[PDB]
Nucleic acid binder design. Structure first.
Ligand SMILES: [Mg+2]
Ligand SMILES: [Mg+2]
Ligand SMILES: [Mg+2]
Ligand SMILES: [Mg+2]
Ligand SMILES: [Mg+2]
Ligand SMILES: [Mg+2]
Ligand SMILES: [Mg+2]
Ligand SMILES: [Mg+2]
Ligand SMILES: [Mg+2]
Ligand SMILES: [Mg+2]
Ligand SMILES: [Mg+2]
Ligand SMILES: [Mg+2]
Ligand SMILES: [Mg+2]
Ligand SMILES: [Mg+2]
Ligand SMILES: [Mg+2]
Ligand SMILES: [Mg+2]
Ligand SMILES: [Mg+2]
Ligand SMILES: [Mg+2]
Ligand SMILES: [Mg+2]
Ligand SMILES: [Mg+2]
Ligand SMILES: [Mg+2]
Ligand SMILES: [Mg+2]
Ligand SMILES: [Mg+2]
Ligand SMILES: [Mg+2]
Ligand SMILES: [Mg+2]
Ligand SMILES: [Mg+2]
Ligand SMILES: [Mg+2]
Ligand SMILES: [Mg+2]
Ligand SMILES: [Mg+2]
Ligand SMILES: [Mg+2]
Ligand SMILES: [Mg+2]
Ligand SMILES: [Mg+2]
Ligand SMILES: [Mg+2]
Ligand SMILES: [Mg+2]
Ligand SMILES: [Mg+2]
Ligand SMILES: [Mg+2]
Ligand SMILES: [Mg+2]
Ligand SMILES: [Mg+2]
Ligand SMILES: [Mg+2]
Ligand SMILES: [Mg+2]
Ligand SMILES: [Mg+2]
Ligand SMILES: [Mg+2]
Lengths: 71, 119, 87, 50, 52
RNA sequence: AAAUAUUGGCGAGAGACCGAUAGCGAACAAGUACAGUGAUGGAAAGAUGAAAAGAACUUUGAAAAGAGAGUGAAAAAGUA
RNA sequence: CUAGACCGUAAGGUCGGGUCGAACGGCCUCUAGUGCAGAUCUUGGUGGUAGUAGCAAAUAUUCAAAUGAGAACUUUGAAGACUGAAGUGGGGAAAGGUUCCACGUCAACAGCAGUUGGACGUGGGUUAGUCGAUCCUAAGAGAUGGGGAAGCUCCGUUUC
RNA sequence: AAAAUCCACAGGAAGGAAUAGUUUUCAUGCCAGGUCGUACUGAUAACCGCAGCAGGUCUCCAAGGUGAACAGCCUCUAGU
RNA sequence: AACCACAGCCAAGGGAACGGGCUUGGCAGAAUCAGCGGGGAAAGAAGACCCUGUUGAGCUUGACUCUAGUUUGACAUUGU
RNA sequence: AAACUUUCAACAACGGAUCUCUUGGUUCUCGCAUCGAUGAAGAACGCAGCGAAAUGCGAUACGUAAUGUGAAUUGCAGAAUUCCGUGAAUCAUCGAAUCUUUGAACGCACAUUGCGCCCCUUGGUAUUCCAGGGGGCAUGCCUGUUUGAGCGUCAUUU
């Protein structure tokens, strides 16, 4: 997930199982004030939902990940 | 330590909403820190603080609704008493005590008397 | 080949999980649970099956609401709150 | 089946999280009598019948 | 208890299986399957003349 | 209404009852593990010591472990 | 536990010695789920058989190095072979459910072995407007209206 | 097979005029496209047969030679 | 793993009328290996044939006793 | 003579009998009357700093509020002006709440985490499209309300 962060402009999130791609897009925009280009979602083999949230070219994923706190 | 509900009750709705958002942010930041720190005990304190704020908010909204429906028929069913299905089915004390005028006349005329076998 | 070579054809399923009781007794073609009798309104039960009744009866689960009824009874189904503040 | 229902995958995810030995510190608790994970399941030994 | 030793659907296997004719628990997969039942000589069976 | 019933529920008090192959199937994560497509079927499994004081340390061994040393009233109590 | 002792025809009783660790007897009476060699007896444990029968279908292995405590079996190289495209190849559908992959690692399991493994321990991994489901109807299934049925329910699928 | 679904035609309801009144199944332009599945085996060891059982279990692709040939035999890719 | 009362050399006798054991003789020397099918009335199963049981079941029919259905009559529905 | 077989004893095994123990069962007696559409019993899934289960709970998730008590919890880690205190605790009590997905289970459906409609509201240029948030939409039956049907039927009237 992290190599995706500094290579694909992608933030990888565990999100609610009740969240759809619209809600994930809206939440990321509100919690992190970044603009979202695309969201891909999958249900992991442990029952949680993983969201691949790619940002627009105008935002970096490293700086946002740093601002959130990890890496 | 967490929040105290008796402190929270002296706050307005906007203040409780603001504290609730602040605590949710705190939990989100702490769940990020849990990724690197092997153990995090502060999570539980903030989680219970969120429950305490939501509890107080709910108590204030429910109380204000009770005031809205004060002393009028047809309360909301959630604000009615939750005794038991059969107990809520039972005749009221008024209905149970109802008698015919004929029975009431007999009860007045010939009540059970107090007496003793002594003399 | 009624035995071992016929046992290699067992790859369909007659029953799957029942919505009501989670039993894998929901007969797929009859759309009936052979355990609980879903979707019939009543729960399937029999007096000749005393053990089955024991397996699914009241008290073998959580009793999410019944577990507190005797306490509320013992307090008279009171309403309100406790009065004082502290010692 | 590789094209499954969500209900089956959900049950498989629960079984995946259950698949583990006993946590070691449980044996150290006062008055512990739990020796191991008596409900340990394995895909080769006992099928889970959906 | 009047049901002690009898909460079982055990039946005899009859002759020709090289075992005694005591009724036996059916099914499989649990170690109790195939064992004797209902008898005063049987483990987990019913006592002779249960006390009333 | 009461006097009557009550192998269920809740709350109590008891026994010339059983004492872990007994006593409920179940004293224990027991209607559990497990079998069966399914209805259903359905176990086994209690006890170190007063206290882990659950054997530091040396030595042989690749290691398990052994031999010492030691703890303990007792290791002829070492979680086999 | 005890080819140590004594009493009783006997059922049995008593004593010494060892082991052991928390309760138990004599006598007078009361009571019973009260005495086992057998029941192809029940449950559990254990033998002889016996280091025995065997571990012989699918053509087949070999040299060296590396690893390791340990190599017929792990890895790499070399070599000899085979499947011979209706395959011992490359994907899938039912089914399984993490077996996939990585690190660690060998008590148990892989009816020899094992440093290897579908094993054990800990993690990682499944990204869709266009691929599927989802929509359609098929043989069928089945509510409603309504009629049967003591009833559980049954009939029927456009009917009055 | 059926149905969903798409189109066409017949019909002519209604609507439409100034510098382009309208209309545009022509072109270009803007936005969005949710949910669940997706790893791997698919079998002389991942399925069923008590198991790591010579059994059973649907299907797609298919090289050169010999030869009538998807026969038998030998070979290349791949695999063991 | 089957199997196993205890076991394992014969001859004859008697014996529940075919003995490894009992009686009288023959004899008889540790421990064993490969093979073998005479014997162990070898093992595999409370003979499936037969008979008995006041034990069944499948099937048949003019058995005994009934029965679904169906037919016939009467009453009711049922009036003018 | 050894080995071997057999018997006995000692020590060591194998195995788990015996004895002693018992937060369990069984039987008797006494007292009480309290599930559910205000959504039960039951089911699925999830929730802890480190839990697989049992138990507890429901996204407020081994719990929140209240009340009492009066300093714990504990296997480690952590915290411990709050410890002469509106106050620790996996404490007791419990009257306020929360109560995922379901289930008689109720928008329709359900081997689907499938598919609609109505109201409010927010965002995307938006009564119409898409999306977010909140609230609704089952059946039988009763009382009432309103809107209707029938030359069933009564009066009325150029
Ligand atoms: Mg998805
Ligand atoms: Mg997807
Ligand atoms: Mg919490
Ligand atoms: Mg066969
Ligand atoms: Mg057959
Ligand atoms: Mg079928
Ligand atoms: Mg599903
Ligand atoms: Mg018993
Ligand atoms: Mg028992
Ligand atoms: Mg001692
Ligand atoms: Mg001893
Ligand atoms: Mg001891
Ligand atoms: Mg002796
Ligand atoms: Mg003691
Ligand atoms: Mg007896
Ligand atoms: Mg005996
Ligand atoms: Mg005897
Ligand atoms: Mg051999
Ligand atoms: Mg070849
Ligand atoms: Mg060949
Ligand atoms: Mg594949
Ligand atoms: Mg694994
Ligand atoms: Mg081996
Ligand atoms: Mg080995
Ligand atoms: Mg490896
Ligand atoms: Mg692998
Ligand atoms: Mg894929
Ligand atoms: Mg794939
Ligand atoms: Mg099976
Ligand atoms: Mg040619
Ligand atoms: Mg004998
Ligand atoms: Mg003898
Ligand atoms: Mg003989
Ligand atoms: Mg003699
Ligand atoms: Mg002689
Ligand atoms: Mg012979
Ligand atoms: Mg016979
Ligand atoms: Mg016979
Ligand atoms: Mg006779
Ligand atoms: Mg027959
Ligand atoms: Mg509810
Ligand atoms: Mg508590």
């Amino acid at each position: 997930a992290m190599k995706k962060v500094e290579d694909g402009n992608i933030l990888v999130f565990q999100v609610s199982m009740k969240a759809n791609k619209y809600q994930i897009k809206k939440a990321v925009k509100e919690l992190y004030e970044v603009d979202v280009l695309k969201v891909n979602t999958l249900v992991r083999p442990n029952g949680t939902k993983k969201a691949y949230v790619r940002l627009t070219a105008d935002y970096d994923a490293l700086d946002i990940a740093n601002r959130i706190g990890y890496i | 330590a967490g929040v105290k509900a008796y402190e929270l009750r002296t706050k307005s709705k906007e203040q409780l909403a603001s504290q609730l958002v602040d605590l949710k942010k705190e939990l989100a930041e702490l769940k990020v820190q849990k990724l690197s720190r092997p153990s995090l005990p502060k999570i539980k304190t903030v989680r219970k603080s969120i429950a305490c704020v939501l509890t107080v908010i709910n108590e204030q909204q429910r109380e204000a609704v009770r005031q809205l429906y004060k002393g009028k028929k047809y309360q909301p069913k959630d604000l009615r008493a939750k005794k038991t299905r059969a107990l809520r089915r039972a005749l009221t004390k008024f209905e149970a005590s109802q008698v015919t005028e004929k029975q009431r006349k007999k009860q007045i005329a010939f009540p059970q008397r107090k007496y003793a076998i002594k003399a | 080949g009624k035995g071992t070579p016929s046992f290699g054809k067992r790859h369909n399923k007659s029953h799957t999980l029942c919505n009501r009781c989670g039993r894998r007794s929901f007969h797929v073609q009859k759309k009936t649970c052979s355990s609980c009798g879903y979707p019939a309104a009543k729960t399937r039960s029999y007096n000749w099956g005393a053990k089955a009744k024991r397996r699914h009866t009241t008290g073998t689960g959580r009793m999410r609401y019944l577990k507190h009824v005797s306490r509320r009874f013992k307090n008279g189904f009171q309403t309100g709150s406790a009065s004082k503040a502290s010692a | 089946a590789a094209q499954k229902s969500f209900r089956i995958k959900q049950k498989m995810a629960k079984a995946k999280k259950q698949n583990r030995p006993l946590p070691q510190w449980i044996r150290l608790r006062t008055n512990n009598t739990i020796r191991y994970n008596a409900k340990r399941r394995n895909w080769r030994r006992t099928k889970m019948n959906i | 208890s009047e049901k002690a030793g009898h909460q079982t659907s055990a039946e005899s296997w009859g002759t020709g299986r090289a075992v005694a004719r005591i009724p036996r628990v059916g099914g499989g997969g649990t170690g109790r399957s195939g064992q004797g039942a209902f008898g005063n000589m049987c483990r987990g069976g019913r006592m002779f003349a249960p006390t009333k």
